[PDB]
Design an enzyme around this catalytic site. Structure first.
Site, short mmCIF file in Angstrom:
data_model
loop_
_atom_site.label_atom_id
_atom_site.label_comp_id
_atom_site.label_asym_id
_atom_site.label_seq_id
_atom_site.Cartn_x
_atom_site.Cartn_y
_atom_site.Cartn_z
CG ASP A 99 39.59 38.18 32.74
OD1 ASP A 99 40.52 37.47 32.31
OD2 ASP A 99 39.26 38.23 33.95
CB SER A 101 52.67 24.91 26.09
OG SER A 101 53.88 25.19 25.41
#
Length: 330
Positions: free
Chosen positions: A35, A199
């Site tokens: 994770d 992004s």
């Protein structure tokens, strides 16, 4: 040193991925959910409340000659999906794909929430976010990666998740045969303890690319792709009959649909998520309403590039003094 381990979807939907991890002496192999959005290595154990164990493999520290109680240490964690676990702490030897760390904090669960009990395939979590998020008190502990880093050939790990197929976590090296083209690296902020990056935009299907900054986290422990409501609405508007359902808890679409791809930007590069990766199947057995793999982050408070996004790429988690993230197509 290096390590390399195969990671395997837990079910036919790629709801999560499990990776075998050796703990203790003699080794006890548990299948852990790696994770990159948390920083605790915790396991089902001989200390876990019996009624909260249902099929998981447990760590038994009393059977490990290298286990030592970390006296006074406790831990307690709550995840974004509302699940939780807590307990006490041992140090022990932990190996992943041939890479060994001695003295790793292994957090033994005394209690786990229902979602963990109900998932027989996940024996615990191995956190790979920054150690500043580790919940052990009163002495915070380091992640497996943080402990291994100085010994690694290069201070990196990579995630290469499969679509409906196994993939690979590598530690200490970049497998140049595992991706196509080049790896594009992008800046990371560690201020919130995550692999947080920005992004450069998105496209829906064959549509034009929208240049827009989207801050979010690379999180292997989250199944879906959670993005701003504007972006998510633009995606689902291209699927006839798709709608946001408050009763179901997100966007659903007719199972008869063919889903468009979704592209996200990494600098000047582009990662394309095929439409099929965005299908999470019937909302309930036999339903013709299917659950979408792109959902709104509104009210999560952060955008999450979870497995839906990451499995479309070869992803480098660069833990150099100034961390960065790399993405390549594959």
């Amino acid at each position: 040193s290096t390590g390399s381990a195969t990671t395997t979807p837990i079910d036919s939907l790629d709801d999560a991925y499990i990776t075998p991890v050796q703990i203790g002496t003699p080794a006890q192999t548990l299948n852990l959910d790696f994770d990159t959005g948390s920083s605790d290595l915790w396991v089902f154990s001989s200390e876990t409340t019996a009624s909260e164990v249902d099929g998981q493999t447990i760590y038994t520290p009393s059977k490990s000659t290298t286990a030592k109680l970390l006296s006074g240490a406790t831990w307690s964690i709550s995840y974004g999906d509302g699940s939780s676990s807590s307990g006490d702490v041992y140090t022990d030897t932990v190996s992943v794909g041939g890479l060994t760390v001695t003295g790793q904090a292994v957090e033994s669960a005394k209690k786990v929430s229902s979602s963990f009990t109900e998932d027989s395939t996940i024996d615990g979590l191995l956190g790979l976010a920054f150690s500043t998020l580790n919940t052990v008190s009163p002495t915070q502990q380091k992640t497996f990666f943080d402990n291994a880093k100085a010994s690694l050939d290069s201070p990196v790990f990579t995630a290469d998740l499969g679509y409906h197929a196994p993939g690979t976590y590598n530690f200490g090296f970049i497998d140049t045969t595992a991706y196509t083209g080049s790896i594009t690296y992008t800046a990371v902020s560690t201020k919130q303890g995550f692999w947080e990056w920005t992004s450069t935009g998105y496209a829906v299907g064959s549509g034009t690319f929208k240049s827009t900054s989207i801050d979010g986290i690379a999180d292997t422990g989250t199944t879906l792709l959670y993005l701003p409501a504007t972006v998510v609405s633009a995606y689902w508007a291209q699927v006839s009959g798709a709608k946001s359902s408050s009763s179901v808890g997100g966007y659903v679409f007719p199972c008869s649909a063919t889903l468009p791809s979704f592209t996200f930007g990494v600098g000047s590069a582009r990662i394309v998520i095929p439409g099929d990766y965005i299908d999470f199947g019937p909302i309930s057995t036999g339903s013709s309403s299917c659950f979408g793999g792109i959902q709104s982050s509104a009210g999560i408070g952060i955008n999450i590039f979870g497995d839906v996004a990451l499995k479309a790429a070869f992803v480098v988690f660069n833990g150099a003094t100034t961390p960065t993230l790399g993405f390549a197509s594959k």
